[PDB]
Short mmCIF file of N, CA, C and O and ligand atoms in Angstrom, two decimals:
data_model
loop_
_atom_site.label_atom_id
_atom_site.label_comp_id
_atom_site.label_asym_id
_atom_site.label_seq_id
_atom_site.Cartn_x
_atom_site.Cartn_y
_atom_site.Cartn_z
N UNK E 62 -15.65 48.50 -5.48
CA UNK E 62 -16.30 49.74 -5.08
C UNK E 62 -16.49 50.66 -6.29
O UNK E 62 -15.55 51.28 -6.79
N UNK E 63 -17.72 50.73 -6.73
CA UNK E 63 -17.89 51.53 -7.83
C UNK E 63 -18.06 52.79 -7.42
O UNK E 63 -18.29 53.17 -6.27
N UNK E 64 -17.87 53.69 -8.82
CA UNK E 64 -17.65 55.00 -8.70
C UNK E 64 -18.51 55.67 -9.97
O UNK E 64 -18.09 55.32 -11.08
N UNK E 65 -19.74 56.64 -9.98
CA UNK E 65 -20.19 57.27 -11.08
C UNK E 65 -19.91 58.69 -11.76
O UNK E 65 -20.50 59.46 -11.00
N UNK E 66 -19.38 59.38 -12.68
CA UNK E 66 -19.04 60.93 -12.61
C UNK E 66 -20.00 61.45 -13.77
O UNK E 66 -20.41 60.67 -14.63
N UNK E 67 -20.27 62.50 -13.76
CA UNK E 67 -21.25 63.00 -15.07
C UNK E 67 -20.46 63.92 -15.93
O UNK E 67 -20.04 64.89 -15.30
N UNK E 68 -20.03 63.87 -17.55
CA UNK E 68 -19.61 64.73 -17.98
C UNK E 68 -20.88 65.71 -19.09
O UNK E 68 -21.62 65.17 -19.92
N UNK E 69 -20.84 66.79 -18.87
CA UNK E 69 -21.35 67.63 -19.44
C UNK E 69 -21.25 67.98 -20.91
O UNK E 69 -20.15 68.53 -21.02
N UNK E 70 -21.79 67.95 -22.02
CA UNK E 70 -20.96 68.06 -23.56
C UNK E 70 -22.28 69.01 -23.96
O UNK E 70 -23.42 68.77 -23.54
N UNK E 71 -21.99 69.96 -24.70
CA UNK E 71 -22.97 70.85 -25.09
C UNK E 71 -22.35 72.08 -26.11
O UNK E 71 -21.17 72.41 -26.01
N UNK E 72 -22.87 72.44 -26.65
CA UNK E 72 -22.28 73.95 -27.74
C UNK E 72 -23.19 75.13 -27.58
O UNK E 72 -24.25 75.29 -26.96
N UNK E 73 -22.27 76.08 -28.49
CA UNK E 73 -23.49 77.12 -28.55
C UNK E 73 -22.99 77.51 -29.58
O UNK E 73 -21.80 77.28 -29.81
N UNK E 74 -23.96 78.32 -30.65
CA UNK E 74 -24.09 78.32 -31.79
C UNK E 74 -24.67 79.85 -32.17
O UNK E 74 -25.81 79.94 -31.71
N UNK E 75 -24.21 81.22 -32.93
CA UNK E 75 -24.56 81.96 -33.00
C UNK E 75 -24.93 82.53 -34.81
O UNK E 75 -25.05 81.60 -35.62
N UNK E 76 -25.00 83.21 -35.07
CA UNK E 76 -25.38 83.81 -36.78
C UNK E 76 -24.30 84.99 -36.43
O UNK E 76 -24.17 85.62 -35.38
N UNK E 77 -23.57 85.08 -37.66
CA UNK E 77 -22.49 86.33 -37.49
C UNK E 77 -22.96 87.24 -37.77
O UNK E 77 -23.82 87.00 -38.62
N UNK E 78 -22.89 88.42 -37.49
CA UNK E 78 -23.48 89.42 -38.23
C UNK E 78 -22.67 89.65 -39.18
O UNK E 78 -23.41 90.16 -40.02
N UNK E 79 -21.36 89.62 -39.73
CA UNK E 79 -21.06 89.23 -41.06
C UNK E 79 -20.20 88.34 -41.57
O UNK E 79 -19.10 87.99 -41.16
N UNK E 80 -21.20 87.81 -43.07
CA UNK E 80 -20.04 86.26 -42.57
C UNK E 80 -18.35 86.53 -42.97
O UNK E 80 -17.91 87.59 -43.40
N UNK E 81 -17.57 85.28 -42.73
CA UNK E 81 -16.60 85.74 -43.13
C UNK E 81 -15.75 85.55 -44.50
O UNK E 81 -16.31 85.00 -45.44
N UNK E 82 -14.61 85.92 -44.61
CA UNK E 82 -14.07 85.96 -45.69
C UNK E 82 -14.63 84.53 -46.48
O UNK E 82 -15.11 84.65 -47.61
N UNK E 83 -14.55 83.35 -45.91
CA UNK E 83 -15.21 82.03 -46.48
C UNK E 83 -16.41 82.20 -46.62
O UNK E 83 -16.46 81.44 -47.59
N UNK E 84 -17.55 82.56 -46.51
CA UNK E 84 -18.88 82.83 -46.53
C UNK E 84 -19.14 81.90 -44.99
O UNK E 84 -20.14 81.18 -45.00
N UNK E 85 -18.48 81.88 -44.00
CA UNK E 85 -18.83 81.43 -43.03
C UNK E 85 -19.70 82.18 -42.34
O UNK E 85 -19.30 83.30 -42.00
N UNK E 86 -21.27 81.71 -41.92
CA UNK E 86 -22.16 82.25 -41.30
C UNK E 86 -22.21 82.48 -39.94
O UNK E 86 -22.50 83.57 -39.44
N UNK E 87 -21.89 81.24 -39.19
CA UNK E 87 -21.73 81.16 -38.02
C UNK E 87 -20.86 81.03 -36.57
O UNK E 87 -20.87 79.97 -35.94
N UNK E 88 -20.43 81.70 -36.31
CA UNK E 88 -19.59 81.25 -35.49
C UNK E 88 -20.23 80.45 -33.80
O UNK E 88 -21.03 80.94 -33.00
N UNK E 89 -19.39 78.95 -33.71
CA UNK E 89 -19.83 77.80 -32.63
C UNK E 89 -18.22 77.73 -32.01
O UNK E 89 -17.06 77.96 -32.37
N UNK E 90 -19.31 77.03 -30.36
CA UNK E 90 -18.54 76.42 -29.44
C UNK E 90 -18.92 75.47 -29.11
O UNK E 90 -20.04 75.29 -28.61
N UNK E 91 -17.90 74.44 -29.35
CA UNK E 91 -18.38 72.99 -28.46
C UNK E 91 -17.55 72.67 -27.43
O UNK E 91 -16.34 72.64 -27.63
N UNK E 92 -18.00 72.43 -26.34
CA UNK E 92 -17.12 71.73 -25.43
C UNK E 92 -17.41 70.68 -24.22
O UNK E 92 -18.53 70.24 -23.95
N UNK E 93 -16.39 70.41 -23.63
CA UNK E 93 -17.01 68.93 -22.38
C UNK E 93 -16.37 69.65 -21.50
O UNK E 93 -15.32 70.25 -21.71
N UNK E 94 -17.15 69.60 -20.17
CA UNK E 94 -16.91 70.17 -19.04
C UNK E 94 -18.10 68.83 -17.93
O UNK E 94 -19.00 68.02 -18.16
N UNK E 95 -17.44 69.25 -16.92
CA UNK E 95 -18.51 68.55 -15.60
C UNK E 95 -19.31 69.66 -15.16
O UNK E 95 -19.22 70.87 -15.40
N UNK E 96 -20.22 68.88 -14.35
CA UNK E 96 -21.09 69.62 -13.64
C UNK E 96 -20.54 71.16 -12.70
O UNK E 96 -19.39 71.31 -12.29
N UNK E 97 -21.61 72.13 -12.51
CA UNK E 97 -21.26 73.18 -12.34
C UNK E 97 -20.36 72.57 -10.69
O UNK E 97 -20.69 71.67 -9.91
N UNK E 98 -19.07 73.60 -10.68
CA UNK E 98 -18.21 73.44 -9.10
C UNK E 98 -17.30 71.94 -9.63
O UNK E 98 -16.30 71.67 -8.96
N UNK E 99 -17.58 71.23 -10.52
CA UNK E 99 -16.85 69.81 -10.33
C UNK E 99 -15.46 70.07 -11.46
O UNK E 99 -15.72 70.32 -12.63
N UNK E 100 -14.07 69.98 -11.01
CA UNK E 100 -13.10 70.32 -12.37
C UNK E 100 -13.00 68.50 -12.48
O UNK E 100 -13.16 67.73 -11.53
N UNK E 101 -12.75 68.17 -13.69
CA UNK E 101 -12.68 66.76 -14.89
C UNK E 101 -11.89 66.76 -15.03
O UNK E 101 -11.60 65.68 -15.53
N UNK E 102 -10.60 67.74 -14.86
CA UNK E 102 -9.05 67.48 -14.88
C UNK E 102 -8.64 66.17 -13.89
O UNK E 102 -7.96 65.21 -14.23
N UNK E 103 -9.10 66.35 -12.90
CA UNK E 103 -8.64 65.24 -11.92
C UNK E 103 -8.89 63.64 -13.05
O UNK E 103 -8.44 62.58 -12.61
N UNK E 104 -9.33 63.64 -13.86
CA UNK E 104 -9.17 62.05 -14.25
C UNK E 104 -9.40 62.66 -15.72
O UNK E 104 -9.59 61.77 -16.55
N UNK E 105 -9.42 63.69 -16.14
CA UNK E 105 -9.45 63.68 -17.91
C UNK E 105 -8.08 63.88 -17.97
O UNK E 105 -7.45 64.74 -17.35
N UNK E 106 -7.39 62.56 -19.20
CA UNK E 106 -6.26 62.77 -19.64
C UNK E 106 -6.28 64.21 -20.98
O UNK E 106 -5.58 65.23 -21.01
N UNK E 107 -6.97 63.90 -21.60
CA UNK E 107 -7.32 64.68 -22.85
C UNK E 107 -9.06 64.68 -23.31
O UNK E 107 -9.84 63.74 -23.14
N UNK E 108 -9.26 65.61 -23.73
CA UNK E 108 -10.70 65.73 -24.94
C UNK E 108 -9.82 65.80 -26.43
O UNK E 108 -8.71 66.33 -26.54
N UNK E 109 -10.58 65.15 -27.54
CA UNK E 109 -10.07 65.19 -28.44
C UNK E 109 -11.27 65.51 -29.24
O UNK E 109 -12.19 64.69 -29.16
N UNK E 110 -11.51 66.82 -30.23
CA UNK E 110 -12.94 66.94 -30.76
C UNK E 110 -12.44 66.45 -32.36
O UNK E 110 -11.33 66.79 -32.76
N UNK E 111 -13.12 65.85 -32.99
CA UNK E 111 -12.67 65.45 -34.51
C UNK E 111 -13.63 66.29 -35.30
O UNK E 111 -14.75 65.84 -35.52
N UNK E 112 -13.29 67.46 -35.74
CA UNK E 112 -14.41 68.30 -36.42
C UNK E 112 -14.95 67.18 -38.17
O UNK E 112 -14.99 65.99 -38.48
N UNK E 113 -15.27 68.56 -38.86
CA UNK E 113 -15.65 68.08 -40.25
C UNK E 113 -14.21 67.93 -41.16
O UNK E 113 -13.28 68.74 -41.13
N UNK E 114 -14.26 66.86 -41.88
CA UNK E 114 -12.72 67.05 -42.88
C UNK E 114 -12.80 68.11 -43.55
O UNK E 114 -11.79 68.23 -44.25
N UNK E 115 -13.56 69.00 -43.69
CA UNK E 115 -13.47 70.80 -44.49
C UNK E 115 -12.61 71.07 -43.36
O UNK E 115 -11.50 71.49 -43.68
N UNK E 116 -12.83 70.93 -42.15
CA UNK E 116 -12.07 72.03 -41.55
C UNK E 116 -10.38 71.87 -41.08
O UNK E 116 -10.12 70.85 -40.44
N UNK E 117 -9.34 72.77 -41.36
CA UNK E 117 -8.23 72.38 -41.07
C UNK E 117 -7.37 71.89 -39.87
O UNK E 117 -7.09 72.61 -38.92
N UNK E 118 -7.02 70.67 -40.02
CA UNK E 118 -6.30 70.23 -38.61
C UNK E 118 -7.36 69.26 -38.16
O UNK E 118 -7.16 68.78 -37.05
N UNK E 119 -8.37 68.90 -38.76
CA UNK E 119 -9.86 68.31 -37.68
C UNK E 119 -9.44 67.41 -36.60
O UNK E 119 -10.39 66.65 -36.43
N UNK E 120 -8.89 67.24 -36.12
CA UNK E 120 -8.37 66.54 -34.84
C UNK E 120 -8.19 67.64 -34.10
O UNK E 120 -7.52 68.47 -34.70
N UNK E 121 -8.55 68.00 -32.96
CA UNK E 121 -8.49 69.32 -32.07
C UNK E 121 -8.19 68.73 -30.70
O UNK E 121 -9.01 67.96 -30.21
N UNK E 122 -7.16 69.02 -30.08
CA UNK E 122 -6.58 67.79 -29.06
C UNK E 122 -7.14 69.01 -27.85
O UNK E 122 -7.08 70.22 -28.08
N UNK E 123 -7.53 68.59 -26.92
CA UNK E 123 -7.71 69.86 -25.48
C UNK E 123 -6.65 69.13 -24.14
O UNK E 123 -7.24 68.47 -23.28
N UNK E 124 -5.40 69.25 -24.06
CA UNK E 124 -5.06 68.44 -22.69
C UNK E 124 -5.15 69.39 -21.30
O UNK E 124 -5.34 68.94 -20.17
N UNK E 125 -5.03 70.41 -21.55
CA UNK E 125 -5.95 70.95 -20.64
C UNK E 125 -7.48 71.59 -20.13
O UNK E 125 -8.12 71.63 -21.18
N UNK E 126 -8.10 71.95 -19.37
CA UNK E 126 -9.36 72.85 -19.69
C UNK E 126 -8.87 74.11 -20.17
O UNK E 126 -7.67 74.28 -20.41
N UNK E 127 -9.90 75.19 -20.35
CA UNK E 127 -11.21 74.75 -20.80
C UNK E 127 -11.37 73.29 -22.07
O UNK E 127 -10.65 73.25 -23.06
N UNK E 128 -12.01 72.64 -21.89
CA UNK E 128 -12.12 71.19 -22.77
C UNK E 128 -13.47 72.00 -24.07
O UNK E 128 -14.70 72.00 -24.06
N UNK E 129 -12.60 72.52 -24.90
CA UNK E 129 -13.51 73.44 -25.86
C UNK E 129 -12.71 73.76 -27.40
O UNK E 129 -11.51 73.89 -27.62
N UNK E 130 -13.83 73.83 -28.33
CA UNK E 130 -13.07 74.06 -29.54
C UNK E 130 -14.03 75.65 -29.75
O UNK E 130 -15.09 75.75 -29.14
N UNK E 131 -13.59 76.68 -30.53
CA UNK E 131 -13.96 77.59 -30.59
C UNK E 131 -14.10 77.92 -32.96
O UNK E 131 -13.18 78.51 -33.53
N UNK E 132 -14.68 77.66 -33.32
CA UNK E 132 -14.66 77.67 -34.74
C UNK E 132 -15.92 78.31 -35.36
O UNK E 132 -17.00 78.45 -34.79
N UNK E 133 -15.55 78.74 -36.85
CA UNK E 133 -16.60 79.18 -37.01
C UNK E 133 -17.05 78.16 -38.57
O UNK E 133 -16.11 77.47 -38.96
N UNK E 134 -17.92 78.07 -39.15
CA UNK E 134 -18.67 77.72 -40.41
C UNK E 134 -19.54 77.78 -40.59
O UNK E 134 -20.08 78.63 -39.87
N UNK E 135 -20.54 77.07 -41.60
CA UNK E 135 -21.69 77.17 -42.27
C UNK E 135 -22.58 76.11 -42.19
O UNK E 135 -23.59 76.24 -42.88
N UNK E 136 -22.45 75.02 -41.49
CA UNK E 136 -23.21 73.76 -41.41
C UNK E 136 -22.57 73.45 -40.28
O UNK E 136 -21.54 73.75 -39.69
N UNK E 137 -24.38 72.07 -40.06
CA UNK E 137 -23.91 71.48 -38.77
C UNK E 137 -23.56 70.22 -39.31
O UNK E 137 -23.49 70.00 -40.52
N UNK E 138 -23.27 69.03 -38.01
CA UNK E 138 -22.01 67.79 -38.91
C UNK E 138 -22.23 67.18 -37.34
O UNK E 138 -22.54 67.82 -36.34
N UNK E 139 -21.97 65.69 -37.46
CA UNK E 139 -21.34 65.49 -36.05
C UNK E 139 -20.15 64.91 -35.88
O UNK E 139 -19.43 64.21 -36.59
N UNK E 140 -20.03 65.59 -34.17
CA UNK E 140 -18.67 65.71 -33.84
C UNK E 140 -18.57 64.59 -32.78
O UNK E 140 -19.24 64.57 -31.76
N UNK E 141 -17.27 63.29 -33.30
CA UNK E 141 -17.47 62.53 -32.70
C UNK E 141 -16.20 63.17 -31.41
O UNK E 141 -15.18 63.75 -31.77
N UNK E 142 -16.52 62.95 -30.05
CA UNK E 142 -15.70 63.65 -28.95
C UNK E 142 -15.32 62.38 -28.35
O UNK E 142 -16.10 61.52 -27.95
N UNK E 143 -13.93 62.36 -28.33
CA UNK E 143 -13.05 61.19 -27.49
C UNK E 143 -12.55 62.06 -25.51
O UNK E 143 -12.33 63.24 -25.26
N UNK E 144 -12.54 61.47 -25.02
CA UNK E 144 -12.27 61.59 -23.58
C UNK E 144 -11.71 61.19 -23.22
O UNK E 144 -12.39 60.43 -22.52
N UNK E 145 -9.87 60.78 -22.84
CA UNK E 145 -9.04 60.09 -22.30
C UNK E 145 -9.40 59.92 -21.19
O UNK E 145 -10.31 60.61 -20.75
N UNK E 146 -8.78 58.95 -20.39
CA UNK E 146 -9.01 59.09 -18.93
C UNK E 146 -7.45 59.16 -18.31
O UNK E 146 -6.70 58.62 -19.12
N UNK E 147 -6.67 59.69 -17.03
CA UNK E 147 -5.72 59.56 -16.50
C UNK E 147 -5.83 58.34 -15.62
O UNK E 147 -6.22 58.18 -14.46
N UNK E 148 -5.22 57.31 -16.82
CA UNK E 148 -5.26 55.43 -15.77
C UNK E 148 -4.36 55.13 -17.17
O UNK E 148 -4.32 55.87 -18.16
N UNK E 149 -3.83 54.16 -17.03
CA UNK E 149 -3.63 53.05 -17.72
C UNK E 149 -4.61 51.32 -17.32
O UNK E 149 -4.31 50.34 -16.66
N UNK E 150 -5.61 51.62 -17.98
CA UNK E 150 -6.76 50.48 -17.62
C UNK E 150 -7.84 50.80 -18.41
O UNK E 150 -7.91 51.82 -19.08
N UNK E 151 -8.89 49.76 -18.33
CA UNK E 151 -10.09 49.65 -19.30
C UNK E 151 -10.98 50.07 -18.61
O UNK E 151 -11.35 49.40 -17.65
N UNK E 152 -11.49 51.11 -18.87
CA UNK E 152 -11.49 51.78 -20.17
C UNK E 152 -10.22 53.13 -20.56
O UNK E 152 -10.21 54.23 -20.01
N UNK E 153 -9.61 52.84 -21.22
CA UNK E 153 -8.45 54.25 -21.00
C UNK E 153 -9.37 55.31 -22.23
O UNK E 153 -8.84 55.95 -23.13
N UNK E 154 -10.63 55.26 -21.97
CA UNK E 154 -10.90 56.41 -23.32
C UNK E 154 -12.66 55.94 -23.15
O UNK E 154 -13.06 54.92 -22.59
N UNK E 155 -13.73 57.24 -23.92
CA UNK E 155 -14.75 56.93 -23.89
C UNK E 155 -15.16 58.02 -25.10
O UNK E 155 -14.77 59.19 -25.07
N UNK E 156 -15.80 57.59 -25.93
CA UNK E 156 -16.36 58.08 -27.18
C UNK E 156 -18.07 58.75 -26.86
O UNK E 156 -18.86 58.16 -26.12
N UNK E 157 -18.32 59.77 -27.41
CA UNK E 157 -19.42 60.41 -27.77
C UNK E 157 -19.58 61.07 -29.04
O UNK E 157 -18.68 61.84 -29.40
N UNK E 158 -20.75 60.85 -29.91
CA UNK E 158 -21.13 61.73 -31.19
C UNK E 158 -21.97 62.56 -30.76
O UNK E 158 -23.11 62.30 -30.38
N UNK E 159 -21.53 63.40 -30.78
CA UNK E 159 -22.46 65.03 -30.45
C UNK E 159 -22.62 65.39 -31.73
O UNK E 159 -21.82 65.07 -32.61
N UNK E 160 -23.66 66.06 -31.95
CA UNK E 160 -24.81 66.57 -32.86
C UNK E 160 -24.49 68.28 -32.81
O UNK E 160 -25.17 68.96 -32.03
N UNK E 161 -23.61 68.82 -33.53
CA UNK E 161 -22.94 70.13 -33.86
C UNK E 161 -23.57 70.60 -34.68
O UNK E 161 -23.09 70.78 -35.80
N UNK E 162 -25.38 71.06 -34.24
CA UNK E 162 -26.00 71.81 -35.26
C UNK E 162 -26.16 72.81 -35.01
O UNK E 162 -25.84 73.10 -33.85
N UNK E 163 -26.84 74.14 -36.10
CA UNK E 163 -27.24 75.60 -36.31
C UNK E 163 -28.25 75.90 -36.95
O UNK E 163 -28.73 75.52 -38.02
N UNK E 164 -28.57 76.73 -36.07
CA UNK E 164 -29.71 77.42 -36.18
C UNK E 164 -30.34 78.34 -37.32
O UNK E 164 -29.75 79.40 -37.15
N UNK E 165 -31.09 78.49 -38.23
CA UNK E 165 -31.15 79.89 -39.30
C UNK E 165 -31.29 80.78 -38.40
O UNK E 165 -31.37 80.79 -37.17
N UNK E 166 -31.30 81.95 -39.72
CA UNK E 166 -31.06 83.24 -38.98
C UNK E 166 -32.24 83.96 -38.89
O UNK E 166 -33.11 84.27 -39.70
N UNK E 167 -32.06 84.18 -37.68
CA UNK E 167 -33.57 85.18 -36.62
C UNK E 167 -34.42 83.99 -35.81
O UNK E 167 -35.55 84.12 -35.34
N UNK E 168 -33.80 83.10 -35.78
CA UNK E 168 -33.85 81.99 -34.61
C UNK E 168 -32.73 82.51 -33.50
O UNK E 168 -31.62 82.99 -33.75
N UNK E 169 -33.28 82.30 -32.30
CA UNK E 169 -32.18 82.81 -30.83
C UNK E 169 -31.58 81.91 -30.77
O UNK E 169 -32.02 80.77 -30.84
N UNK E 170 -29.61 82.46 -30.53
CA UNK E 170 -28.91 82.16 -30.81
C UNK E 170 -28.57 79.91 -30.09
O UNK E 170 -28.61 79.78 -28.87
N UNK E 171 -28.40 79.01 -30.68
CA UNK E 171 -28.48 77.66 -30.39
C UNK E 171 -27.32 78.16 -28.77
O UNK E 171 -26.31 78.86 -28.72
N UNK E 172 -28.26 77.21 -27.44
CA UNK E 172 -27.60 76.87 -26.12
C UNK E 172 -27.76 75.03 -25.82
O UNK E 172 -28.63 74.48 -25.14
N UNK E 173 -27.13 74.69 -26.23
CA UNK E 173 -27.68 73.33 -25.96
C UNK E 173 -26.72 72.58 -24.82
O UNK E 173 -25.61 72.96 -24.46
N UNK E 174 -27.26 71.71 -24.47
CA UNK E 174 -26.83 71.02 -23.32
C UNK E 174 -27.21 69.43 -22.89
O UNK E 174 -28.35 68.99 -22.70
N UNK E 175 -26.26 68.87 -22.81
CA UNK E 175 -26.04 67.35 -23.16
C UNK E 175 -25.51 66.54 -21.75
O UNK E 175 -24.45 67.03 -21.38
N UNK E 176 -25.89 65.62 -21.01
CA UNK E 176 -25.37 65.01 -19.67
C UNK E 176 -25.48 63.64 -19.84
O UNK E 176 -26.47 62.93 -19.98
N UNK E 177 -23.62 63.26 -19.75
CA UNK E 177 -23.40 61.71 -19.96
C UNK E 177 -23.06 61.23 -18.55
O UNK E 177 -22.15 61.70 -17.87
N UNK E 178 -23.69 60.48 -18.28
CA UNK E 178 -22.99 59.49 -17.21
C UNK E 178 -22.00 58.49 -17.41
O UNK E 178 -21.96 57.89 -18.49
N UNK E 179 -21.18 58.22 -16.47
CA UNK E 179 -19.82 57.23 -16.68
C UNK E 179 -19.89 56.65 -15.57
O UNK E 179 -19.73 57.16 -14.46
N UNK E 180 -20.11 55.64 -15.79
CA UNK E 180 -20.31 54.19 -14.22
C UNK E 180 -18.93 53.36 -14.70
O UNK E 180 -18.69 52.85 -15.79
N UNK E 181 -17.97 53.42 -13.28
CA UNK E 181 -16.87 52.38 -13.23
C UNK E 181 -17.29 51.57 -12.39
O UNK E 181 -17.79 51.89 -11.31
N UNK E 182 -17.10 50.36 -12.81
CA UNK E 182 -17.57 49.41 -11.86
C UNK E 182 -16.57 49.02 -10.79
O UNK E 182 -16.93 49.13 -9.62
N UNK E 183 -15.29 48.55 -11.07
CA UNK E 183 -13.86 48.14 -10.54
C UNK E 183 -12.62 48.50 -11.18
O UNK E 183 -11.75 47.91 -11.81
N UNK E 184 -12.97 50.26 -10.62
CA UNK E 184 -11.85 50.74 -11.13
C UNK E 184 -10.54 50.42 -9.66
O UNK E 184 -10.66 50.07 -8.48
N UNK E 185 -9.06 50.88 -10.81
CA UNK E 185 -8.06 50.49 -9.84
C UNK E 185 -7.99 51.76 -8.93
O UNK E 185 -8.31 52.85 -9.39
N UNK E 186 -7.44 51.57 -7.23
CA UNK E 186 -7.38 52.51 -6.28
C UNK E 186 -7.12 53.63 -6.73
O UNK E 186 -7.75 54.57 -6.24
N UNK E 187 -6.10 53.94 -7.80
CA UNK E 187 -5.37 55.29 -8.09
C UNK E 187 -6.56 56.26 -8.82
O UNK E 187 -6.98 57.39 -8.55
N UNK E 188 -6.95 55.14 -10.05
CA UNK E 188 -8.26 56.32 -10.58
C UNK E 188 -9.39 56.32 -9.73
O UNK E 188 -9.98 57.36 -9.46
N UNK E 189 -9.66 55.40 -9.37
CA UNK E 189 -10.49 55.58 -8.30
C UNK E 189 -10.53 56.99 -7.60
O UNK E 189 -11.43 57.82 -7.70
N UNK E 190 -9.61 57.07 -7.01
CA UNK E 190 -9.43 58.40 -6.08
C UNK E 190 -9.18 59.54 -7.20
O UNK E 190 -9.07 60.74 -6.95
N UNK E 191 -9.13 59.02 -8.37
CA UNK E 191 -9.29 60.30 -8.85
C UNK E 191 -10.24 61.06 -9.57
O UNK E 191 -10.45 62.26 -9.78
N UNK E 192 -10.85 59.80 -9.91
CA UNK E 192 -12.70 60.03 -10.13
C UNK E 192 -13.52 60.97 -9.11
O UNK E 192 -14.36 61.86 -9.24
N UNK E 193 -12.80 60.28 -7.88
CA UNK E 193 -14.08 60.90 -6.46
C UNK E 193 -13.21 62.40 -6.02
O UNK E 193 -13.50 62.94 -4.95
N UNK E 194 -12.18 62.97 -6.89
CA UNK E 194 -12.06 64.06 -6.85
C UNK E 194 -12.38 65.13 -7.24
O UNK E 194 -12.23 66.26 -6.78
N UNK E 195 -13.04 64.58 -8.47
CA UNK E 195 -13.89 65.96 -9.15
C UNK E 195 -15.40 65.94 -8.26
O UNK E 195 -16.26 66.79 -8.48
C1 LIG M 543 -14.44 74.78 -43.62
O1 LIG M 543 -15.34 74.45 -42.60
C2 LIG M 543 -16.52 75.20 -42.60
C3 LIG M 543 -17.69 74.23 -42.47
O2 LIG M 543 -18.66 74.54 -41.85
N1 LIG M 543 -17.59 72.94 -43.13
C4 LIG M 543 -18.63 71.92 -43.11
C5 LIG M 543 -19.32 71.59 -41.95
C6 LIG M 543 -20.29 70.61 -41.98
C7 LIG M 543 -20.57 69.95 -43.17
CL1 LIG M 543 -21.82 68.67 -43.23
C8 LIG M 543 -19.87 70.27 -44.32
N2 LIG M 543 -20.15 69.57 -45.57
C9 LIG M 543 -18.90 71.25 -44.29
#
């Protein structure tokens, strides 16, 4: 009995009005969320965002929501985004490279928005039911 869920991955991207002490221009948000009303806790073990190696710590673990990194810099880069799942089974994890770009300035501010689908074909009863909870 298969089961399909949609996760949502998208940023937003603004121009500072001043940059900061680094000459950082911009301050961005990236994050994974589900569809509007649906919570992803029910079967997300973790989001894990792997920023740029400039930035400190680049492994950014989320085990709870909001599933979001909040940072600021000067370039865009991509961000490869890992997704645990709550199972022990295949797939225990699902990879996406999101495209963490910015906008120049006196361009309106970057809203972007990204929709992945996830088809289990024969998942086990437990995730199962926990898929069809979000
Ligand atoms: C210290 O982090 C600020 C920052 O934006 N670093 C950054 C981002 C993307 C690229 Cl492609 C490079 N080279 C550097």
């Amino acid at each position: 009995c298969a089961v399909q869920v949609k996760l949502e991955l998208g940023h937003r991207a603004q121009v500072r009005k001043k940059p900061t002490v680094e000459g950082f221009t911009h301050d961005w948000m990236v994050f994974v969320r589900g569809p509007e009303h649906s919570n992803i806790q029910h079967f997300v073990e973790k989001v894990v965002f792997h920023l740029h190696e400039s930035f400190p710590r680049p492994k950014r673990v989320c085990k709870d929501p909001p599933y979001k990194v909040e940072e600021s810099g000067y370039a865009g880069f991509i961000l490869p985004i890992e997704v645990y799942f709550k199972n022990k089974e295949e797939p225990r994890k699902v990879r996406f490279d999101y495209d963490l770009f910015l906008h120049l300035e006196g361009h309106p501010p970057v809203n972007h928005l990204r929709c992945e689908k996830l088809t289990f074909n024969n998942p086990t009863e437990d995730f199962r039911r926990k898929l069809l909870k979000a």
